[PDB]
Design an enzyme around this catalytic site. Structure first.
Site, mmCIF file in Angstrom:
data_model
loop_
_atom_site.group_PDB
_atom_site.id
_atom_site.type_symbol
_atom_site.label_atom_id
_atom_site.label_comp_id
_atom_site.label_asym_id
_atom_site.label_seq_id
_atom_site.Cartn_x
_atom_site.Cartn_y
_atom_site.Cartn_z
ATOM 1 N N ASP A 169 0.832 -1.028 -0.151
ATOM 2 C CA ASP A 169 0.013 0.028 0.167
ATOM 3 C C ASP A 169 0.840 1.294 -0.005
ATOM 4 O O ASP A 169 2.029 1.113 -0.133
ATOM 5 C CB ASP A 169 -1.031 -0.088 1.235
ATOM 6 C CG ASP A 169 -0.368 -0.063 2.660
ATOM 7 O OD1 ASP A 169 0.642 0.283 2.616
ATOM 8 O OD2 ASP A 169 -1.099 -0.444 3.715
HETATM 9 C C1 LIG Z 1 -6.911 10.133 14.599
HETATM 10 C C2 LIG Z 1 -5.507 10.605 14.962
HETATM 11 C C3 LIG Z 1 -4.620 10.884 13.960
HETATM 12 C C4 LIG Z 1 -4.240 12.236 13.787
HETATM 13 C C5 LIG Z 1 -4.174 12.954 12.662
HETATM 14 C C6 LIG Z 1 -4.525 14.570 12.775
HETATM 15 C C7 LIG Z 1 -4.362 15.107 11.434
HETATM 16 C C8 LIG Z 1 -5.507 16.336 11.516
HETATM 17 C C9 LIG Z 1 -6.986 8.954 13.777
HETATM 18 S S1 LIG Z 1 -5.870 7.400 13.844
HETATM 19 O O1 LIG Z 1 -4.739 7.815 13.106
HETATM 20 O O2 LIG Z 1 -5.444 7.424 15.289
HETATM 21 C C10 LIG Z 1 -6.401 5.667 13.146
HETATM 22 C C11 LIG Z 1 -5.724 4.782 13.885
HETATM 23 C C12 LIG Z 1 -4.327 4.391 13.660
HETATM 24 N N1 LIG Z 1 -3.892 4.394 12.146
HETATM 25 C C13 LIG Z 1 -4.628 3.791 11.042
HETATM 26 O O3 LIG Z 1 -5.636 3.368 11.353
HETATM 27 C C14 LIG Z 1 -4.016 3.931 9.685
HETATM 28 C C15 LIG Z 1 -3.200 2.970 9.492
HETATM 29 N N2 LIG Z 1 -2.449 2.776 8.015
HETATM 30 C C16 LIG Z 1 -3.430 2.383 7.137
HETATM 31 O O4 LIG Z 1 -4.475 2.024 7.190
HETATM 32 C C17 LIG Z 1 -2.570 2.416 5.849
HETATM 33 O O5 LIG Z 1 -1.397 2.514 5.975
HETATM 34 C C18 LIG Z 1 -3.027 3.758 4.897
HETATM 35 C C19 LIG Z 1 -4.424 3.326 4.470
HETATM 36 C C20 LIG Z 1 -2.932 4.702 5.560
HETATM 37 C C21 LIG Z 1 -2.117 3.596 3.773
HETATM 38 O O6 LIG Z 1 -2.609 4.858 2.719
HETATM 39 P P1 LIG Z 1 -2.360 4.552 1.329
HETATM 40 O O7 LIG Z 1 -2.597 3.232 0.772
HETATM 41 O O8 LIG Z 1 -2.988 5.611 0.365
#
Ligand SMILES: *C(CCCCCCC)CS(O)(O)CCCNC(=O)CCNC(=O)[C@H](O)C(C)(C)COP(*)(=O)O
Ligand SMILES: *[C@@H](CCCCCCC)CS(O)(O)CCCNC(=O)CCNC(=O)[C@H](O)C(C)(C)COP(*)(=O)O
Lengths: 166, 77, 165, 77
Positions: free
Chosen positions: D35
């Protein structure tokens, strides 16, 4: 503390009140910071290092508070709360072994989030593999953790550290 | 005696104090600014650097720089 | 562009109303972990590649103090860590990045002190190391958390991304 | 080892496959399941293993095992 190998939500709510491992044992957070519904397995041996294992679960429902605010129009479970579950479970395990004190997260080595929890999911599973328990003036637990959603590994955390302090 | 100096290096890093402060009869808690956490991590840093496992209550007796030095000497030879 | 943001601006961010329609959103209360962004620069910070400083006022009425823990209130470390991820992501949006924010990980986190309800203010300092502009826009940074001027948390290699679809 | 085998190893562990999978014609996203995060991390891991910096505009074109090999051999092998 009389060890049992699994705990219900009511046991975990009792833990938050200080009424599961006695008053001197650690407490879990109460809702809304409590990030598990049940502990399904707890053993003194086993796990990847044969030094202890815990497995826990959280049922996923679109009405969980965090979906509404993180983010508006784009619900996802905050990664920080999955990480807190893992810290909660390390502390809980220290209590289960008989450790007394207040629970405090001390840190973590590498954390990787590679997939997400959406409100359409059924269940999140936490697995904790203990590496070391230090029984000193500070009681400390060291573990690796995994978070799965519906059988799919999505987070890993190396060297979770939690302690119980007086 | 790479031992004595290497141990002082580790203690200085772990407790985040200056080279100057790591005297031989200095107490981790009283003299240096060490809490219960810095102490656990200290001993675990000695275990990792020199390749030696020592149970929790062999520690809790390593309170000073002399103690850490003295202890690891015997376990290295 | 502005270099600082009020509470109202951060609430606007959570509704997707601060940056573009396509810019990332902050979390809304009760997951929003700052009251303000005090400074934001493209240079500066420990690596001279970007800096963010933000604050959270501490009050015993904050929701998390009542439940973590009953009888022993302390700010959850995970929420200070989320503030740092929120700020890294906010920064990517501030530079004009488009996509939904997502935390990706962190290298090492150490908690050496606590935030009690008697504290006045928590300060977050983010020091950018690298921004990668590809299909995923990724920011890499070190973070510090201070309470009333004393350093209590550090995090190395905070990673956050902005993604499409 | 050769540039070709070090690149393949990094690709393998980064994407969670063993070598027999990592064929020169293999595309990271179409064939190997990467990805947007995996590709960013893979190129960064390459920068680190071969001590070279790759600009984003360049990194964007490294989409196959062969393209990574050619890139590293070309800068400066
Ligand atoms: C809330 C906190 C994020 C703070 C960002 C603030 C900016 C305004 C949401 S979370 O980040 O905590 C979600 C839980 C942790 N991470 C994930 O769920 C994403 C994990 N990664 C993926 O699913 C893939 O790496 C992705 C889809 C991101 C790859 O993208 P690409 O193929 O286009
Ligand atoms: C609650 C969630 C953790 C749940 C785990 C326990 C379940 C039973 C909030 S936090 O633990 O995350 C608070 C995070 C901030 N960290 C701390 O407050 C502890 C940081 N470390 C210290 O403060 C020192 O190491 C102390 C002084 C407490 C060491 O004690 P020692 O001298 O005996």
């Amino acid at each position: 503390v009389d060890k049992r190998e699994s705990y219900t939500k009511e046991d975990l709510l009792a833990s938050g009140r200080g009424e599961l491992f006695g008053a001197k044992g650690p407490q879990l957070p109460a809702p809304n910071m409590l990030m598990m519904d049940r502990v399904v397995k707890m053993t003194e041996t086993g796990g990847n290092f044969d030094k202890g294992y815990v497995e826990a679960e959280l049922d996923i429902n679109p009405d969980l508070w965090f979906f509404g605010c993180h983010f508006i129009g784009d619900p996802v479970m905050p990664g920080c709360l999955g990480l807190d579950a893992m810290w909660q479970l390390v502390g809980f395990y220290l209590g289960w072994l008989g450790g007394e004190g207040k629970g405090r997260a001390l840190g973590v080595g590498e954390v990787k989030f590679t997939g997400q929890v959406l409100p359409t999911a059924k269940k999140v599973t936490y697995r904790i593999h203990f590496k070391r328990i230090v029984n000193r003036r500070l009681i400390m637990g060291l573990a690796d953790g995994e978070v799965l959603v519906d059988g799919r590994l999505i987070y890993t955390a190396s060297d979770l550290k939690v302690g119980l302090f007086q | 005696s790479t031992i004595e100096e290497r141990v002082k290096k580790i203690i200085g890093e772990q407790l985040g104090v200056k080279q100057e402060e790591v005297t031989n009869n200095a107490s981790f808690v009283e003299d240096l600014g060490a809490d219960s956490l810095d102490t656990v991590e200290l001993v675990m840093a000695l275990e990792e650097e020199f390749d030696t496992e020592i149970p929790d209550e062999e520690a809790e007796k390593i309170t000073t720089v002399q103690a850490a030095i003295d202890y690891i000497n015997g376990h290295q030879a």
